[PDB]
């Protein structure tokens, strides 16, 4: 179940946009994994934990991503609550709604990997993640 299993900045960015401060349980957020010029990236995954777990636990997976663009993204085959390329073009934005979970689910670090011709992987801090709390 999920494989899946260097901060700072790179020029990929993981963003929410409208910059929330918190997450407000069952608002949709558009999040968004963009490649400044001239990159791009072929592939993708994007996940969203709870903080301080590693991912390979059903449970340690917050919240519920939807599919806006069916031709560019869907859920991994083998990792059904991680966001993956639909096919390996090459790609400068990729957008998906994630909706906020339950109150007390405590803090969300959205976090997301790419392949250009390297591999960026998860961080626990750098552009490619975003740590959101209630409040």
Not at 68 to 96: G, H, K, L, W, Y
């Amino acid at each position: 179940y999920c494989s899946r299993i260097r901060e700072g900045y790179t020029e990929f960015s993981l963003r929410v946009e409208g910059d929330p401060d918190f997450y407000k349980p069952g608002t949709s957020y558009r999040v968004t994994l963009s490649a400044a010029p001239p990159s791009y990236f072929r592939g993708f995954t994007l996940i969203a934990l709870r903080e301080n777990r590693e991912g390979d636990k059903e449970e340690d997976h917050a919240g519920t991503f939807q599919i806006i663009d069916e031709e560019e993204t869907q859920f991994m085959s083998n990792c059904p609550v991680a966001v993956t390329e639909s096919t390996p073009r090459r790609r400068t934005r990729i957008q998906v709604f994630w909706i906020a979970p339950p109150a007390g689910t405590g803090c969300v670090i959205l976090k997301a990997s790419i392949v250009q011709k390297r591999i960026i992987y998860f961080q626990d801090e750098g552009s490619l993640t975003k740590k959101l709390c209630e409040q």
